[model samples]
Target: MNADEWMTTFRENIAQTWQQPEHYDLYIPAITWHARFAYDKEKTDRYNERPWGGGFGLSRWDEKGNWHGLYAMAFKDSWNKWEPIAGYGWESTWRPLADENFHLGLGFTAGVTARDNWNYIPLPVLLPLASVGYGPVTFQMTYIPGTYNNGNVYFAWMRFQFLEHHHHHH
Candidate 1:
């Protein structure tokens, strides 16, 4: 199919998935910045090695206030160690307490980490995703607990809406 045709089908699928217009508005682009902190030497050799990165992706909310999206980023293994470390992942967030200015949710990210000279390592990441939105500015965070011999990852972002989609109801 062509571009317009594909978009039309996508819209149809979204319309079926989301029953209301307000929920439709939640499907938009998001910019996220992330930082992975390794407090121990389990994930890396250096104890102080922390990776920081940024990503661009799409975020959407369902009728039940669930958020989900996928993103990719170029991450640094450490401030001192310079190597090509990258990540790509998708997450699902469940917001139990939310409003116009504050939101708290728990989510899981099933993703992989890739290095310059090695294969991809699978990381089943579970964390809490939070957001605070006031007016046109929004702040988001993902805090991954470093327990059970896993590395702790912390991700934060300042995001804004870059595109708007409008649909007429028939």
Candidate 2:
């Protein structure tokens, strides 16, 4: 499609997606952890590697096995500061080793992360996402790739879904 046509289609699709988030199939809370790659010990030591935080996600799976969702998190920043981020993205996962219980996901997450470095202004972030899951718990990670000595960080987290709880009543 031409540029104009593509833009029109994009707008329509986004609008439709925005209007229909009422049916989030998988609504779960997640715990998050942040780590530096250890490529630079000095640089890594200057930041908080274990910034314990939490997040929440809501997603829907399509008939064709594609998942789209929105996510947000509150965590510690590189400077041991508070950081909050939120965004929407899409993903499609599969079983790499033919294990039905194991899921491997590779996708992109685009969102705004607020940090103290840039006067706490919300910076737009689009990062590569990776996730692995088994049963009701899923592990996900996103990378902040950098060149020589900065901005290369890894954010990993886990999510637990509760199918149901058992109770006996008289």
TM-scores for all predictions? 0.41, 0.51
Which ten contiguous residues of candidate 2 have the minimum total lDDT? 22-31
Residue range 1-170, candidate 2, lDDT tens digits = 99999999999989876775543223223544445444677645675545456565555667787766567667765556766777777788876666686888777778788765558578887877876878777777777777845766666665665322235473
Write down the lDDT of every candidate, Cα atoms only: 0.49, 0.66
* Full-model lDDT, candidate 2: 0.66
Off by over 4 Å in 2: 1-51, 76-82, 95-99, 114-119, 147-155, 162-170
Strongest candidate by TM-score: 2
Candidate 1 residue pairs in clash (backbone atoms < 3 Å): none
Best by lDDT: 2
Query: What global local distance difference test value does model 1 have?
Result: 0.49
Location of the lowest summed lDDT over 10 successive residues in candidate 1: 20-29
